[PDB]
Swiss-Prot record, chain B:
Subcellular location: Secreted, Cell wall, S-layer
Note: The calcium binding of this protein may mediate surface attachment by ionic bridging between the S-layer and a specific membrane-associated oligosaccharide.
Protein's name in the database: S-layer protein
Function (record text): The S-layer is a paracrystalline mono-layered assembly of proteins which coats the surface of bacteria. Probably acts as a physical barrier to parasites and lytic enzymes.
Top-level taxon of the source organism: Bacteria
Amino acid sequence: VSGSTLSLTTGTDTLTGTANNDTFVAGEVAGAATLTVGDTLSGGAGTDVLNWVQAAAVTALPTGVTISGIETMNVTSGAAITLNTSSGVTGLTALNTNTSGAAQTVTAGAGQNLTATTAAQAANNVAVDGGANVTVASTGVTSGTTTVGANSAASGTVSVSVANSSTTTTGAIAVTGGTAVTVAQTAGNAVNTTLTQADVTVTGNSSTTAVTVTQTAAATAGATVAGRVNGAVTITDSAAASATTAGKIATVTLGSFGAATIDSSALTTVNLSGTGTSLGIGRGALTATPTANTLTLNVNGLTTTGAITDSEAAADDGFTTINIAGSTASSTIASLVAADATTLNISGDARVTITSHTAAALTGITVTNSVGA
Amino acid sequence: GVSGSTLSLTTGTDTLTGTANNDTFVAGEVAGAATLTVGDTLSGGAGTDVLNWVQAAAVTALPTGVTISGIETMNVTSGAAITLNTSSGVTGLTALNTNTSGAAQTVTAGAGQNLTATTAAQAANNVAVDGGANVTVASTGVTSGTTTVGANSAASGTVSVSVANSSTTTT
Ligand SMILES: [Sr+2]
Ligand SMILES: [Sr+2]
Ligand SMILES: [Sr+2]
Ligand SMILES: [Sr+2]
Ligand SMILES: [Sr+2]
Ligand SMILES: [Sr+2]
Ligand SMILES: [Sr+2]
Ligand SMILES: [Sr+2]
Ligand SMILES: [Sr+2]
Ligand SMILES: [Sr+2]
Ligand SMILES: [Sr+2]
């Protein structure tokens, strides 16, 4: 049931909503902000919203402001947003911060889903921390960077979308922590131009079980063709350097990639698609000899120009069984390097081509792929 | 207790009298200007009444000519330092709560007033409290800043000090 609209003032407000769905409006009055020192907002029962909008940059939650009972907080500025809602804000489950052509530096409470939406980001940087589920939705990015969890990891999942239609190389994307991470890049430069996409670094924490990093497929620029180069990808389990602590990242998905590396003692499955350069797979640095030594490569329309390498096998304990499952569209791996592999199984319903392989310890290759290998 | 009214002070000279019930006096800011101002007169009346004094500017004293009576609890929050002595005047006050972040506190409470000084990110700023009935100091983010209770007048009741430091700078 529709409730009331409650406009804040340039003074200290004490506003309590109804038992219904209310909208708290923290706009401007003649250019002056109305979310101001000492404001106390209580949504009451129902699904309540606070819309905080002002032309001037948002620089902080003001002194003495308390917000309770409001389920959604929308923050829109005509300039940058710098905001920490990890204190004074009870009951918020959705925090949405919105800029265009300006930076965002946002820290949310661990129970607040954060969505940072930036248009025309260009050379401005976006940094978000805290939150439950964290979502970054960035368009018109050029050299500006995208950083999640450098100070405090998301309690839930992380989803980053960065779009660049310039020829200026996309600023680096870094994510630290989260239960599952997806970094999705797109390149939208015009034909007969080339754009290099952002390097991506994803460092898991104790909760990170899966990481996904996708980009626009690489291509050579021509009169009819927009050129694209894929960025590097670095994915590191939090326990990658430990001799005793078990890993957590079990699945990695790459949709087109430059020079990519994975390091996780828990890794069992890698899903690959698009245009890849190279992929090196490390399994951490545990001293104990591993018992699960099966690697599954699920490929779908994958083309690599370089090698997929088990980097652990040469001097440590690599994978002994490699399962390659081809799906939906044919794949071509330029080189497969696996110094400890003794069994290679190739399955699926789409062709798998391995142009060259270096795996001297192999004793058996068996193909069940219905299309062929 | 039964809830009463909310009484917002203004940037003009206020004369505010509460209801026989539990009232909340709000002494905030209007567009950056304090609303607790010279000559203000506050009278809580019967019931359990509270004054919330919040402003970005430092608190250095009660403004000239201000009279406060019948208000049992006073909360003081500043964006800068707090320097305040409530051991005379403010008749009927039994609880004083002072709150800063990254700024010093120098507070003297009356011998019948429970004092709670809460400082976040105290760092190198010093906290000094005197007087009071039961005295509570709750400080986080302390570094080299000191904590001094009762150097000029001892608490009439108990003293409870909590000091948290997450730096490598000796507390
Ligand atoms: Sr206000
Ligand atoms: Sr409501
Ligand atoms: Sr409420
Ligand atoms: Sr509500
Ligand atoms: Sr290793
Ligand atoms: Sr080892
Ligand atoms: Sr080996
Ligand atoms: Sr006044
Ligand atoms: Sr009263
Ligand atoms: Sr009273
Ligand atoms: Sr009175």
